[PDB]
Design a binder for this molecule. Structure first.
Ligand SMILES: Cc1ccc(-c2sc3ncncc3c2CP(=O)(O)O)cc1
Ligand SMILES: Cc1ccc(-c2sc3ncncc3c2CP(=O)(O)O)cc1
Ligand SMILES: Cc1ccc(-c2sc3ncncc3c2CP(=O)(O)O)cc1
Ligand SMILES: Cc1ccc(-c2sc3ncncc3c2CP(=O)(O)O)cc1
Ligand SMILES: [Cl-]
Ligand SMILES: [Cl-]
Ligand SMILES: [Cl-]
Ligand SMILES: [Cl-]
Lengths: 331, 331
């Protein structure tokens, strides 16, 4: 798996070579700089998942070119990721990303990052064309990536309406709403997309199979994010900033369901300010509501429920496809 | 033509209806607001051109559904336009657009406009799917719109490298470069895209025919922009701001080819400042170099050359497809 990871990373150089072949040379040079800064330095889990799932699904239809297409579509997933991140960082006014200055914050990039991010998106379909245009699943993959982009965008919109950074409102933060943001903004592209892509590459194109896989994978994405929000605040540290940013965090959502009217007010006064004594006091209200424990409870039920989902909906894909993801997430 | 224009506009309401069908309802409401503010209020020439060209190309394969698909793909062109404009306005820090406050400048939109613009792009492929997924040209159209987006982005990058607003450099402003910016940023999507789309809808999918049409239409896009840059400064007024913004304008490009070293300096000191006496003095240097006259000369040659292009490359499409565009532009 750490070995697969370095093969996946080593293939990047070729991705960049093929995307970067007279007077537009300067544009293409800037494209290369954008690729290199923004598509590298994550953990590569989403793109890798394409490759791993592709191997588990397919073994005597794995010639070097099949493999090369799998690495490439994995790279397409990472590019879609990069597009989202560069754009989200600008929208959120973030400072850092992946251990570096966010791209838009580099001197001389600024809002030109909007176009750079568009270029990252565009690169997905260039690669798909270059490597997959002859394949029976080509159109299936173009449509998967487009639908993933739309779901992710539509979730981002929902998020932005829900949690405007700099304006405290908690009547927006409902369970139904939290779950809707996670599904659209995060789970579809992070969980469904990579396995779905691998399924199509493997010839598995049926609506029912895809719907079966989606059921499991969206539910995994919900836990993954819920765990993310818990760890943001209670992890062993990268200290998080979710309460400082008026996020629609699973933590705050539970808080609000579980709170007396006096506690509602303690949240009103401290959710969103930058002051560490103000951040200290929501955290302590979360501890007073035993939210680490509700999470622990939540993690157990969620795990049971996922395995029931896999039991029920995995067939006829190898359960291992799902289990390896469950393994990674439920760590 | 003004009648066709109002039918085209009246179809918008339906476009919006079909794009705007539980908890993501709020996102979809915001999507509607984005569509309504940003896809309306232009002249609709690019989208209309799809419809007009579709009628000229196809008459006993024009059932109500064929027509509805043509209006829709026209709308897809306008959406691609809207995506570009909303994003470009943010990148350029523009104030107004189409007689209104630019979307990003509306209170409470701000940089959330980045996602709204992504949503406009996404809507293109939703409509294509909704209306064209069964058609033989479906994939041809998805790929056309993707390639148009890429060309436009790659040209925008070239522009942004060439003309960084707030930093005077004129060694960048070369003929070869000007022409490269116009082709990628403007001509492909403005001229090739709508006719190309109409060609595919009509069954005309050959690489040679498309390459023939492209030759004419890219050359029209070059003139159209060159005329734009001339009129920006010398039009009968919407007063333009190109010299105030250090644009790589056809005017400045000619100036620089035609200038003594002393005049180079007069340009160094006045290209880009906001001061109307400073803007007054480039304008007057353009008049002193008889650039209105070089343009007039340029417009005549360009017109001859286009008609030679149509003569040579139109067949077997009806020359009228091109001529109506030439008519509109050479007004
Ligand atoms: C498809 C998929 C696979 C793995 C992840 C994980 S496992 C993990 N462990 C510690 N920290 C983060 C993660 C992630 C999320 P990330 O790949 O770093 O965005 C997320 C999605
Ligand atoms: C392949 C695989 C997937 C998931 C597990 C996990 S994660 C978890 N979290 C809370 N409780 C139980 C589990 C399990 C089953 P375990 O008791 O570690 O073998 C173990 C192995
Ligand atoms: C395909 C196409 C058709 C028409 C245009 C024209 S004609 C005209 N006349 C005055 N002012 C502008 C124009 C345009 C450009 P625009 O449709 O307003 O962006 C541009 C492109
Ligand atoms: C269909 C049609 C297309 C173009 C023309 C134009 S635009 C132009 N600009 C400079 N010189 C000539 C032209 C012509 C030919 P014209 O002499 O107006 O009939 C006239 C009709
Ligand atoms: Cl092969
Ligand atoms: Cl850094
Ligand atoms: Cl029909
Ligand atoms: Cl207004």
């Amino acid at each position: 798996y750490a070995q697969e990871k370095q093969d996946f990373v080593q293939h990047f150089s070729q991705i960049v070579r093929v995307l970067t072949e007279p007077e537009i040379g300067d544009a293409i040079a800037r494209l290369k700089e954008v690729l290199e800064y923004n598509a590298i330095g994550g953990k590569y889990n989403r793109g890798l998942t394409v490759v791993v799932a592709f191997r588990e699904l397919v073994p005597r239809k794995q010639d070097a070119d099949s493999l090369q297409r799998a690495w490439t579509v994995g790279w397409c997933v990472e590019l879609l990721q990069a597009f989202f991140l560069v754009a989200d960082d600008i929208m959120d006014s973030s400072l850092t990303r992946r251990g570096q200055i966010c791209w838009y914050q580099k001197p001389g990039v600024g809002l030109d990052a909007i176009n750079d991010a568009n270029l990252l998106e565009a690169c997905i379909y260039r690669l798909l064309k270059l490597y997959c245009r002859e394949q029976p699943y080509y159109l299936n993959l173009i449509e998967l990536f487009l639908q993933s982009s739309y779901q992710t965008e539509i979730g981002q919109t929902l998020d932005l309406l829900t949690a405007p950074q700099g304006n405290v409102d908690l009547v927006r933060f409902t369970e139904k709403r939290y779950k809707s943001i996670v599904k659209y903004k995060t789970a579809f592209y992070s969980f469904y997309l990579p396995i779905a892509a691998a399924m199509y590459m493997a010839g598995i194109d049926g609506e029912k199979e895809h719907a079966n896989a989606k059921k499991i994978l969206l539910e995994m994405g919900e836990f993954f994010q819920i765990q993310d929000d818990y760890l943001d605040l209670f992890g062993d540290p990268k200290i998080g900033t979710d309460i400082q940013d008026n996020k629609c965090s699973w933590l705050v959502v539970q808080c609000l369901q579980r709170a007396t009217p006096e506690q509602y007010q303690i949240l009103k006064e401290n959710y969103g300010q930058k002051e560490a004594e103000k951040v200290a006091r929501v955290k302590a209200l979360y501890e007073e509501l035993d939210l680490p424990a509700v999470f622990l409870q939540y993690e157990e039920d969620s795990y049971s429920h996922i395995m029931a989902l896999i039991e029920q909906y995995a067939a006829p894909l190898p359960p291992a496809v799902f289990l390896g993801l469950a393994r990674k997430i439920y760590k």
